[PDB]
Design a protein around this nucleic acid. Structure first.
Lengths: 155, 81, 50, 60, 135, 119
RNA sequence: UUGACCUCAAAUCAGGUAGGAGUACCCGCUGAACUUAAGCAUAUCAAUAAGCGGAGGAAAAGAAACCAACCGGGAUUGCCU
RNA sequence: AUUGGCGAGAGACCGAUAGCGAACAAGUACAGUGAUGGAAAGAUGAAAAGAACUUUGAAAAGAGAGUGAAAAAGUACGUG
RNA sequence: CGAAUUUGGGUAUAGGGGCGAAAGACUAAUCGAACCAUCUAGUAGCUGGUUCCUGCCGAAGUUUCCCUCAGGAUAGCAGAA
RNA sequence: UGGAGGUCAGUGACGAAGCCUAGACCGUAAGGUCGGGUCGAACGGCCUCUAGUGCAGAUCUUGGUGGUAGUAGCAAAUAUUCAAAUGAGAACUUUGAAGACUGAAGUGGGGAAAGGUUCCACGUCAACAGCAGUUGGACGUGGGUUAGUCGAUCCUAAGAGAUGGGGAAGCUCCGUUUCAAAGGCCUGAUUUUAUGCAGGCCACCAUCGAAAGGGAAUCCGGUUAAGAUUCCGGAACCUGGA
RNA sequence: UUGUGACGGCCCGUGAAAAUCCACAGGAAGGAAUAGUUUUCAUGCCAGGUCGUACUGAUAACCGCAGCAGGUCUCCAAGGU
RNA sequence: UAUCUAGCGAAACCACAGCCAAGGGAACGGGCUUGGCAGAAUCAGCGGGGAAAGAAGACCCUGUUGAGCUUGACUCUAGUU
RNA sequence: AAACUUUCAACAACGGAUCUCUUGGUUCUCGCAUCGAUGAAGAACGCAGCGAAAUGCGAUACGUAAUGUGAAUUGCAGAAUUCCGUGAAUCAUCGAAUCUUUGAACGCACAUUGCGCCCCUUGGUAUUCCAGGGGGCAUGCCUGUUUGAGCGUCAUUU
């Protein structure tokens, strides 16, 4: 909130052949006489500085949330929608895909991969594995360095 | 004659170095420092001088004793070896 | 002035000691970007005004 | 000619030179150098030779 | 009263603030008495005070103080609560009886302004409370 | 490397004083040699050795004074603990744990009971 | 005359203790004006900024000289209202 | 409660005229008697391998040569 | 141009204050109220600027009230749904 | 256009981004796509989300650059010249000669404030000395300031300023002998115990404040690259002690 | 030119203080003889610490943004006209 | 001095620029219209023009913008009684 | 018709945009409570084998102890068998110390590295003077100790 305002700059007024923006006083600095306190000014405050009381979370009706969840569940059982979503389910016998509770009881990653191979989700797995690519911007140094697809959801 | 000829006449320091802060802010005739308020017990400080507080505050110097207090507290103010 | 005080003379000594250029070997020190003394002083250029 | 502790006076310098080099001194002069350190000219008595004491100390 | 300490009565503002003479200090004569006493005897803690005498010019008070470093007070839990640091300069923070009276710390509808603290209440009812999902 | 504090700790008062004296003499001689020689890193080691001798002497003296004042109150201020100004002004464990006889009687009569809601 | 007592002193007497920092939050005192009122003086800004004194890890408040008018609730604090 | 202190974890934030004034010997350099004011300034290359040697110049330096993936990277160094 | 003289150093007076053989003069190139930081991003019916393209529609300077006359409200004119 | 969720198991060190290119294509346009050069590590299409999202102007901000322009100009303080030396190089450096000037309220010899090493020597000319430079108050490296007698230190001046005390919410204000119980100074006690005490005298108002006021005392000759009333030789003086 | 002396003029102006040193009044106290007193007579013994000290002081060492025709206190002062 | 040469080397200002006559036009054009005309590159001067440059007119008016000063303005106030 | 003005391209300049990078910032959340007369925060001056500097430290001075790890530090130099080890290190940890002159700052003073006094010790034929070493001497207030003062005042005498 104090960015761009930690100066005592005052406008010189008219009659000095310079614009009327506030200017830093003093001397012998290289910064004295320079513009301050403006969005157009280097080192000044930005226009309408970003505030933390901006609305971040947005409320949704519980019923509309449940409507969207039901629609997504129903879409998970549409064969064409899954392919359009791009999920490599061509080799799967039929969807929705239901597996015994022994999968709930599974224990190791090797046998989880084996189960995926058995039921046909492995193709989705290789899609996610071979989709790993660097992000295309300044999101790399914001702890978002890599991007990859979404695989199967085991429910 | 208020400009250059008058600037020719200034050779008498009104401020010398202050004992509490070495700032050349000690007024000789007023016997008080214009920066830290020496010889007053309280160091001179103002809530409109935020930059001045930045320049003169804890952590600006060596902190010859306060820097180890966090370590001693973390270890529980222990005596022994 | 000729008639100085010891405080002023001590500041003079400190200034004279500080006024020297970079030792050559700090330049060769690794991860070093210092190339010269940027706090160098000349008696005509800048007054320390103590 | 010695570099001397800045807190040392002529009495202390005389006593230290006498205790350190087993020599009697005649006079001590001191000056604070422009680099801020004390410099002492200690004149010994005629019974002693500064050159011999210097080459005893190590510097010819 | 407490004459406004401005020079020549010039207040440099609105006529509402131009008053100099009949202005009244918001703390009690008891409060300033125990404040001065505590500042003099800065090693004790002001336990209480009371009125003894008054003439035209002065009011006279007697201030009870307790030594927090005396071992007769430090032990004997009857009075060693005063030896904890949170009671440093009760007379200065307004924690004595006169201090509470002048602050207005009392239960009821007549003290809605100053019950939990005047400035604390003002802050609480002048803050803008925004939640994550805006209400 | 220089001298070692553990072997310095076995020496007595006169031994440590003698070692300090000739270490100081050797430092003086090394300073003279440094006046003429380009670089003289042995002077650092000798200065460190003098520091070692001095800290061992000071530790012995402080332990002797601690033994002298052992058992009695009013330790010398540099010998008593150095926690914190507030940590020293604070009431001790005994002084804080002090409680009146009325509250003690109430506490013994009615201590917070240990109970569970199941049946 | 010899001993108290009361009040007041002195001591490089014995032992302590206060000051000063930092002050985001906290407890008070003091205290504007710009500003809004399309002028402006009450009002507003604001019992805010600046100024002063005082704490803690929180502070403050706190076990009713309360609320209420009900088939009554029951220290304080904070949130929603 | 908490834009201070000490530890941590994070972000649909900024990306060297931005973000703190300060990514750098930054509250530094230096301006003012003083209160105070207050910057600019990041990037060779993976590794200095930072150019031996010859030649022309008083020298700076050039021309060759050489190192290097690159000298259309030569410290006045990424791109330009 | 021997004095109501000139001048060094010390010292006193500090901002609605000082000091003035008086000019609103001087008070650090600042004076019909110094300078510094803050309130403060003070307010402005006033001046200036206001950043891509194409498509369709497309004005008003008039009514009433206003310390109203360089400005608003209202009705009109206009777009969109 | 920056960033975000999905997707193209998208492009890429066999060359991403960026930049340059009177080269091509597409769109009315905003713009998109591609050929070539440069470069060296990331980036894009699509469906959506989001915003610190698009500049020609604001005497806009910061930085950079022009024409003017090799232009105005470098003209106050009488003035320089000849020859050697050094040097790559001399109008400007050194030396010699000549001509001059300051003309003793100096362009001389010293100091006060201020400066702070500018002093002196050696080396050296990238920058600085608005021409030049071999020179320099520049740059690099070093050397140098020696006191009983000179000052400060001591005194008090105008004044400043604790204490006692009184104001003030308070930061602090007044006050300086005031409505104070305000100390140090002579000689014996003087080693059954000390510096105690039945020894004695008194009763100042703290303190700071002058490197030109007041004050204890040093002169000559010689000596250094640079210090000297300070070192040395000689010759004295004062203060305090025994 | 400087110092000194004895004088004279001027003032409704008559032109610092203190430290410090000495002296006088008084007479406390003490004092003989192979030795007392005199350390204000002469001679003789010891010590004298701390800090400054270089250089410029200006048409180039200070201030004026600079090596700025400006400003900035003072001592010495040859011959002729 | 200007001038020419060696060295050194800025600034103001600048939409784009730089020949006129008349016309019309924001009623005094360098540009537009119609005529006159019109030949590289330039040097020293000069002061007619560029309504030349220097400064968001300091006169005047407007603003529900100030400030200094005054008073039997309105509203208060230190002091005093 | 070169010279010259202008336009464009290539190469070279000037400048430092763009792109990519990031040991920095900013915002949110979580946890904790610890400055100082036992001398803080801050200041000054010093300390490294070669350092001038937002480093670290204090005449024990880029640090000493103690502990842990286990062979470095490194720009150059270097003590130089310190390497199957009470043991390298610009390491980490950190509980013992040192901690100059100051600073609320404390004998008085402070534009002075000025001036005292007190107590021990050592020298100068010395309780007194001088010098050196060590240790001290602030203010307010509290509790107590001792020494006092006051016809304020109570008992014990002509």
């Amino acid at each position: 909130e104090k960015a761009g305002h930690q100066t005592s700059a005052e406008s010189w007024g008219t009659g000095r052949a310079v614009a009327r923006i506030p200017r830093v006083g003093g001397g012998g600095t290289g910064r004295s006489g320079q513009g301050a306190f403006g969005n157009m000014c280097r080192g000044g405050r930005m226009f309408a500085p970003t505030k933390t009381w901006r609305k971040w979370n947005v409320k949704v009706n519980h019923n509309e949330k449940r409507y969207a969840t039901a629609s997504a569940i129903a879409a998970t059982a549409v064969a064409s929608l899954v392919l359009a979503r791009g999920h490599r389910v061509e080799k799967i016998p039929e969807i929705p895909l239901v597996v015994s509770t022994d999968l709930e009881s599974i224990q190791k990653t090797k046998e989880a991969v084996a189960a995926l191979k058995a039921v046909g989700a492995h193709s989705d797995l290789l899609k996610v594995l071979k989709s790993k690519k660097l992000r295309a911007g300044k999101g790399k140094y914001r702890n978002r360095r890599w991007t990859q697809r979404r695989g199967p959801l085991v429910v | 004659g208020k400009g250059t000829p008058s600037f020719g006449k200034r050779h008498n320091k009104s401020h010398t170095l202050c004992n509490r802060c070495g700032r050349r802010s000690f007024h000789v005739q007023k016997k008080t420092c214009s920066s830290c308020g020496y010889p007053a017990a309280k160091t001179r400080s103002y809530n409109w001088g935020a930059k001045a507080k930045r320049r003169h505050t804890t952590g600006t110097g060596r902190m010859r004793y306060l820097k180890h207090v966090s370590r001693r507290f973390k270890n529980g103010f222990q005596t022994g070896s | 002035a000729a008639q100085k005080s010891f405080r002023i003379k001590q500041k003079m000594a400190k200034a004279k000691k500080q006024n020297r250029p970079l030792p050559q070997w700090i330049r060769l020190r690794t991860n070093n970007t210092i190339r010269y003394n940027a706090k160098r002083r000349n008696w005509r250029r800048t007054k320390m005004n103590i | 000619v010695f570099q001397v502790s800045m807190k040392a006076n002529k009495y202390q310098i005389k006593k230290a030179v006498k205790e350190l080099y087993e020599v009697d001194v005649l006079k001590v002069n001191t000056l604070v150098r422009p680099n801020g350190t004390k410099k002492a000219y200690v004149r010994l008595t005629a019974d002693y030779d500064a050159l011999d004491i210097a080459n005893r100390i190590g510097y010819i | 009263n407490r004459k406004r300490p401005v020079p020549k009565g010039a207040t440099y503002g609105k006529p509402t603030n131009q008053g100099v003479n009949e202005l009244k200090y918001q703390r009690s004569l008891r409060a300033t008495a125990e404040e001065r006493v505590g500042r003099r005897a800065a090693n004790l803690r002001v336990l209480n005070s009371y009125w003894v005498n008054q003439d035209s010019t002065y009011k006279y008070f007697e201030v009870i103080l307790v030594d927090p470093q005396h071992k007769a007070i430090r032990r004997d839990a009857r009075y060693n609560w005063i030896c904890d640091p949170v009671h440093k300069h009760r007379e200065a923070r307004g924690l004595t009886a006169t201090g509470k009276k002048s602050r207005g710390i009392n239960k009821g509808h007549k003290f809605n302004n100053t019950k939990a603290g005047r400035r604390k209440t003002w802050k609480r009812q002048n803050t803008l409370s925004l939640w994550r999902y805006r209400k | 490397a220089g001298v070692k504090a553990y072997e310095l700790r076995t020496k007595s008062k006169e031994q440590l004083a003698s070692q300090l004296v000739d270490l100081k003499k050797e430092l003086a001689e090394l300073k003279v040699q440094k006046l003429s020689r380009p670089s003289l890193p042995k002077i650092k080691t000798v200065r460190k050795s003098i520091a070692c001798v001095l800290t061992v002497i000071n530790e012995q003296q402080r332990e002797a004074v601690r033994q002298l004042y052992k058992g009695k109150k009013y330790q010398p201020k540099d010998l008593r603990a150095k926690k914190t100004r507030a940590l020293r002004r604070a009431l001790t464990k005994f002084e804080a744990s002090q409680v009146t006889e009325k509250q003690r009687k109430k506490q013994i009569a009615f201590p917070q009971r240990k109970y569970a809601i199941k049946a």
